């Protein structure tokens, strides 16, 4: 159970910067085993984009949580930042706040000033782990 580069290259067939997107995607899914590349429609049935869906390990108050996220890579990735969302399961609820809006969209200085090649997905996830470690984007349903 693993995704080969061939399957990835196919997903980003319509992207403007293919090799760059594939390279970073491989780097991300190798380090973060619970993130998986998925090709799905975004907003319109004709608008297919690849996203990384799954969880990332976030330490909070002495315990590690698998925070559910979805990172949509635009067809202009890595020159434009990904559009990121928290994806709560039925057992949790989104915590609207400083870094999460009403739709679950994530806001971070790293995304706001995103600039290739200094900015990348590995750096973005590292930031998320730190920021969400201070303020979780989701909490369980008590």
């Amino acid at each position: 159970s693993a995704v080969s580069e061939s399957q990835l290259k196919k997903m980003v067939s319509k992207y403007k910067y293919r090799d760059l997107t594939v390279r970073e995607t491989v780097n991300v899914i190798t380090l973060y085993k619970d993130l998986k590349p998925v090709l799905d429609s975004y907003g319109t049935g004709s608008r297919e984009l690849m996203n990384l869906t799954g969880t990332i390990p976030v330490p909070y108050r002495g315990n590690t949580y698998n925070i559910p996220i979805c990172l949509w890579l635009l067809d202009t990735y890595p020159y434009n930042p990904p559009i990121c969302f928290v994806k709560p399961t039925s057992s949790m609820t989104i915590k609207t706040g400083k870094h999460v809006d009403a739709n679950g969209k994530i806001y971070l200085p790293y995304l706001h000033e995103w600039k290739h090649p200094q900015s990348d997905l590995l750096g973005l996830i590292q930031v998320m782990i730190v920021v969400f470690g201070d303020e979780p984007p989701v909490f369980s349903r008590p």
Partner: peptide
């Protein structure tokens, strides 16, 4: 492996 979240606090 499985999505988890901390309790309110």
């Amino acid at each position: 492996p499985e999505p988890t979240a901390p309790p309110e606090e």
